[PDB]
Design a protein around this ligand. Structure first.
Ligand code: CHL
Ligand code: CHL
Ligand code: CHL
Ligand code: CLA
Ligand code: CLA
Ligand code: CLA
Ligand code: CLA
Ligand code: LMG
Ligand code: SQD
Ligand code: LUT
Lengths: 60, 221, 236, 37, 34, 67, 51
């Protein structure tokens, strides 16, 4: 061949993960954002002035 | 939810005719499972609770530590001398010794006795401090011997006592799962001879074909 | 035993001159106070406050500001300002912290220059370029490229010095104690603490002069510490 | 390795200082000898 | 190009993760009604 | 009237505090005059080198010194 | 009324807007440098570096 390319186009890879580094990128970023979300769930709900019980939720 | 008489129990709807009287629900991880009566003695129950959490904390480190090098060697560019956990000890007898992350410039240990001498000194001191309840110059005096907190909780994740009770259940439940999985790591290593990560990918390739019963059950007797 | 045999036990305050007087601002309480301040840098400074020049273009006359008063600011007052904690630059206690920090760095540097020259055989000046091109310690090549070490050195020293600046008590800024005095040698207010602190400034001032010797000798002779020593012996 | 042109440049700097010193000296002398108040 | 792909994957995942956990943060309650 | 307070503003506020403070009298003026005189002599010397009114043996002061 | 040659004297005693006004000249000067370079690159012929 003449030059080098990823050669992943049109190959049906899961999520386009040609190399494992892409897997780490998606997993690490998601875990971080979920991590900061996880520690804030109680505060976010407290504003509702209601407990997140079985009756909690915008309902009509 | 996790404490008191209405706690979840290990036999689900049938766990009422065998929950011991002494298992009341004042400690994390209490599902009422003492069918052998090994904790009938209140003092022995106290020590067993310490051993369980210590065995659990080691297993949580063990489970992550036994598979993290294998995950890195397979799904990253890191090239360990021996990623598989039950072959990692023999790395120190190799020509280059044991190189952390495969890099000759990291650790580069080459004598097993020097590593062992350092370990029995470092672990010996640390285990003594935990056993005695106080470190050098009374570092941890007056702190709980199982849940010291203080210096061991730099992020203060357990300052709220109610959050502590919830998080203790998380520690023992993750720890019990790690202990059980380390039993799997031991037996799967013996039966399969492959790394635990290699075993998982084998199940995923064809679960009906690559499992214990279709590969190894006939050989164990 | 007494003595007074091979020595003259004269009574006086050890000063930098055989006969002179301590400056009024140099009492002698601080460790290493030898009454040495010919330039009066630690003399309590007096300043004048000029008023704000008039710069309003809506006014017919904009006269410049005049002396609004003479004030002597109180020095050696640390505040929560991260960038300028001390009240005045020219304070005795701020200078002592500068003297100690400059001195403690020189003590490590004076020992560090000698040890690496005797271990690696390379001059401390030539050592900087060698490690820049090939990161290495004691002959072992380090597993980190120089670019990362450059950022790490700035970040690590950045955090370390930011921790140092958190302290507000002026005496504790010069003598943190705690984790930095694990053996509790001079954590009390004893005479041993005073004597130990007196030893520290002497070794510190020695190292500051000594490392000034290293750089000038390297500039002039072109050799390092041990190298300059060998050159002098051969010079004979 | 001082060239003669370099010496004259140094000599000119010194001579310039002497001219300035002579000016300042004369002015300070007359200013003190003939003072207001 | 791989460095480019990983950078883009990190960026795309970051904004999508914000979107997903943004609406999971009691969004229906973020309204001026009573 | 105090103005808008910002985290960067409080950090840099000490650097803009001693507006009118001055040293009494002439202060370090004589010391400043020394450096100006040395700077004036330095400017003269480099001017003479470029003007070729000072000839130094090592310097050539021409394009040929690019070699 | 203010003369036309003293208009930009309103930031003489306004440190906040003096920075803003000095940020605008800085924006223009760097804007010129980028614009000038792009023009020159559109006209420059690198084929013959000698003649
Ligand atoms: C603390 C627990 C611990 C465990 C469970 C093991 C386990 C093992 N080490 Mg090992 N080591 C441990 C600590 C340490 N080792 C070493 C240094 C070495 C070296 C130098 C070598 C090993 C090797 C081995 C393996 C031998 C092959 C074998 O028997 O396979 C069949 C058995 C299994 C696969 C299952 C293993 C489970 C184990 C038998 C039961 C689990 C419970 C234990 C009894 C824990 C006991 C703890 C006590 C001592 C406090 C094996 C899996 C060898 C190796 O890597 O071989 C390639 C080897 O050469 N270790 C050090 C530092 C000095 C340790 C310090 O703590
Ligand atoms: C004085 C030095 C000293 C040192 C170096 C250590 C070091 C250690 N202790 Mg330890 N300990 C020390 C004193 C003491 N400990 C304990 C009680 C415990 C317990 C109960 C446990 C440890 C554990 C540990 C290990 C993990 C803890 C951790 O990551 O926490 C910091 C956490 C995040 C940074 C670790 C190697 C743990 C262990 O053995 O893990 C298997 C553990 O469970 N220590 C006491 C009594 C209160 C001490 C002194 O009085
Ligand atoms: C006390 C009970 C019990 C004992 C002592 C043994 C002993 C033995 N079984 Mg076995 N089995 C037992 C129960 C059961 N087996 C099987 C299915 C098989 C198979 C398919 C095979 C064996 C085989 C064997 C032999 C080889 C060891 C091995 O690989 O184990 C395998 C053990 C299992 C597959 C069963 C796992 C435990 C069992 C489910 C526990 C039952 C209690 C609860 C359900 C557990 C709750 C948690 C060995 C002598 C092998 C053999 O015969 O080699 C020639 C073999 O190929 N067993 C089932 C149905 C799933 C069991 C149910 O109770
Ligand atoms: C940067 C290093 C440094 C600093 C900050 C200080 C600071 C201080 N010294 Mg010290 N000293 C030093 C180096 C330093 N010294 C060295 C290397 C020696 C050995 C010669 C001494 C020997 C010495 C003695 C004997 C005494 C002091 C004393 C003092 C204190 C009062 C004097 C003063 O305020 O002047 C401030 C000093 C400076 C602002 C440093 C700047 C000086 C110029 C810029 C350097 C000149 C170039 C140099 C010669 C090369 C003060 C806290 C007196 C004291 O103990 O008071 C309690 C005292 O008795 N010093
Ligand atoms: C202010 C203190 C100071 C500073 C800035 C340095 C800085 C340096 N030292 Mg050094 N050193 C010091 C104190 C210091 N040292 C002291 C007190 C000792 C005696 C224990 C030594 C003994 C020493 C040796 C033996 C060597 C160095 C070397 C080096 C150079 C690179 C190695 C390195 O630091 O990697 C991080 C180390 C971990 C570097 C310029 C190495 C070198 O190769 O220099 C060319 C080297 O071989 N140092
Ligand atoms: C960094 C240099 C600098 C700066 C910051 C200033 C700043 C200022 N000058 Mg000034 N000036 C400068 C250089 C500078 N000058 C030079 C070199 C000269 C000699 C020619 C002058 C001569 C001068 C005079 C005579 C006066 C000022 C005045 C003023 C003040 C009001 C300016 C105004 O609003 O006019 C507004 C200007 C216009 C509305 C239109 C400007 C159009 C000009 C004629 C040509 C266009 C130039 C072009 C757009 C940009 C090219 C500039 C670049 C090539 C350098 C102001 C604070 C005035 C003052 O003192 O206020 C009390 C005033 O009377 N300046
Ligand atoms: C990260 C910032 C940065 C960087 C890396 C560059 C880089 C570059 N710029 Mg750019 N520029 C910048 C910011 C930057 N610029 C900003 C913020 C502006 C807006 C003002 C500009 C405006 C600008 C223009 C208009 C031009 C460039 C140009 C250039 C290119 C040539 C620079 C050159 O050779 O001139 C040489 C630089 C100097 C001679 C500076 C001299 C310093 C003077 C003499 C200071 C002396 C007084 C000093 C205070 C003395 C006291 C200190 C002392 C005692 C220690 C170069 C690639 C040129 C170009 O090629 O066009 C694309 C060009 O014409 N830039
Ligand atoms: C999972 C899907 C579940 C069902 C979804 C039903 C809806 C739409 C179905 C469309 C196809 C869905 C496929 C998903 C997998 C995929 O796209 O791989 C990702 C693909 C694959 O990416 C490419 O794969 C190729 C394979 O040969 C090559 O490897 C290329 O290099 C690689 O880039 O790339 C993309 O499509 C980019 C997606 C970026 C994210 C867009 C998010 C938009 C907002 C979402 C908000 C969510 C909430
Ligand atoms: C031959 C010469 C060689 C010289 C070489 C020079 C460099 C050597 C390496 C650096 C040595 C210093 C280590 C850090 C000491 C320290 O202050 O932290 C230890 C102290 C603990 O005592 C805490 O100390 C706090 C303040 S102090 O440290 O006592 O001042 C105190 O408030 C608190 O009560 C107490 O618990 O912690 C702190 O000061 C708070 C920060 C905690 C995080 C520490 C950093 C992580 C470990 C870094 C280890 C690097 C090695
Ligand atoms: C409750 C009850 C009640 C009734 O009454 C009775 C009865 C029944 C008796 C009871 C029960 C019990 C049980 C179940 C038990 C189990 C246990 C276990 C399994 C543990 C583990 C346990 C386990 C564990 C710790 C583990 C650990 C591990 C570790 C550290 C690791 C290490 C390592 C690493 C990392 C890596 C390398 O490479 C290798 C090594 C070196 C090796």
């Amino acid at each position: 061949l003449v030059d080098d390319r990823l050669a992943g186009e049109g190959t049906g890879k899961i999520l386009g993960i040609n190399d494992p580094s892409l897997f780490w990128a998606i997993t690490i970023v998601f875990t971080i954002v979920w991590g900061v979300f996880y520690v804030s769930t109680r505060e976010i709900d407290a504003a509702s002035d209601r407990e997140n019980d079985d009756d909690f939720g915008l309902t009509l | 939810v996790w404490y008191g008489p209405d706690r979840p129990k290990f036999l689900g709807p049938f766990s009422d005719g065998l929950v011991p009287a002494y298992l009341t629900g004042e400690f994390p991880g209490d599902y009422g499972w003492d069918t052998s009566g090994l904790s009938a003695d209140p003092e022995t129950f106290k020590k067993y609770r310490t051993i369980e959490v210590i065995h659990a904390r080691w297993a949580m480190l063990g489970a992550l530590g036994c598979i993290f090098p294998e995950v890195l060697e397979k799904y990253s560019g890191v090239q360990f001398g021996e990623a598989v956990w039950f072959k990692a000890g023999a790395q120190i007898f190799a020509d280059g010794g044991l190189n952390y992350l495969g890099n000759s410039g990291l650790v580069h240990a080459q004598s097993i006795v020097a590593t062992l001498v350092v370990q029995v000194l470092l672990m010996g001191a640390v285990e003594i401090y935990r056993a005695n309840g106080e470190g050098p110059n009374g570092f941890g005096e007056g702190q709980d011997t199982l849940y010291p907190g203080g210096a061991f909780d730099p992020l203060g994740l357990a300052d709220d006592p109610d959050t502590l009770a919830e998080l203790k259940v998380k520690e023992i439940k993750n720890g019990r799962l790690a202990m059980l999985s380390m039993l799997g790591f031991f037996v799967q290593a013996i039966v399969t001879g492959k790394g635990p990560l290699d075993n998982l990918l084998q199940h995923l390739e064809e679960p009906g074909e690559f499992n214990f019963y279709a590969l190894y059950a006939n050989s164990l007797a | 035993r007494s003595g007074g045999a091979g020595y003259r036990q004269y009574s006086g305050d050890a000063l930098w001159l055989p006969n002179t007087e301590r400056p009024a601002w140099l009492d002698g309480s601080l460790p290493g106070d030898r009454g040495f301040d010919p330039l009066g840098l630690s003399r309590p400074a007096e300043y004048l406050q000029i008023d704000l020049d008039e710069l309003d273009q809506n006014a017919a006359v904009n006269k410049a500001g005049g002396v609004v008063g003479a004030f002597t600011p109180v020095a050696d007052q640390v505040s929560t300002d991260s960038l300028a904690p001390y009240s005045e630059v020219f304070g005795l206690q701020r200078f002592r912290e500068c003297e100690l920090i400059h001195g403690r760095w020189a003590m490590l540097a004076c020992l560090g220059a000698l040890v690496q020259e005797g271990v690696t055989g390379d001059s401390w000046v030539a050592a900087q370029t060698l490690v820049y091109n090939q990161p290495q310690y004691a002959g072992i090549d380090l597993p980190f490229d120089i670019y990362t070490l450059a950022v790490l050195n700035s970040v690590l020293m950045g955090g370390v010095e930011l921790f140092r600046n958190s302290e507000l008590d002026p005496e504790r800024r010069c003598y943190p104690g705690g984790a930095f005095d694990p053996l509790n040698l001079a954590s009390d207010d004893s005479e041993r603490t005073q004597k130990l602190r007196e030893a520290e400034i002497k070794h510190a001032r020695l190292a500051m002069v000594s490392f000034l010797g290293y750089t000038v000798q390297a500039w002039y002779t072109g050799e390092g510490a041990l190298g300059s020593l060998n050159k002098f012996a051969n010079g004979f | 390795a001082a060239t003669p042109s370099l010496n004259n440049l140094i000599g000119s700097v010194v001579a310039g200082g002497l001219v300035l010193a002579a000016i300042a000296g004369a002015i300070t002398a007359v200013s003190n000898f003939d003072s207001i108040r | 190009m791989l460095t480019l792909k990983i950078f883009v994957y990190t960026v795309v995942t970051f904004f999508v993760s914000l979107f997903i956990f943004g609406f999971l943060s009691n969004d229906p309650g973020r309204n001026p009604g009573q | 009237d105090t103005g808008i307070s910002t985290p960067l503003g409080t950090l840099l506020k000490p650097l803009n505090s001693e507006y009118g403070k001055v040293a009494p009298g002439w202060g370090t003026t004589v010391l400043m005059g020394i450096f100006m005189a040395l700077f004036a002599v330095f400017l003269v010397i480099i001017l003479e080198i470029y003007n070729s009114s000072v000839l130094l043996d090592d310097v050539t002061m021409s394009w040929e010194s690019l070699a | 009324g203010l003369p036309w040659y003293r208009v930009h004297t309103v930031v003489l005693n306004d440190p906040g807007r003096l920075i803003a006004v000095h940020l605008m000249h800085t924006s223009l000067v760097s804007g010129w440098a980028g614009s000038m370079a792009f023009y020159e690159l559109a006209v420059f012929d690198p084929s013959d570096p000698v003649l």
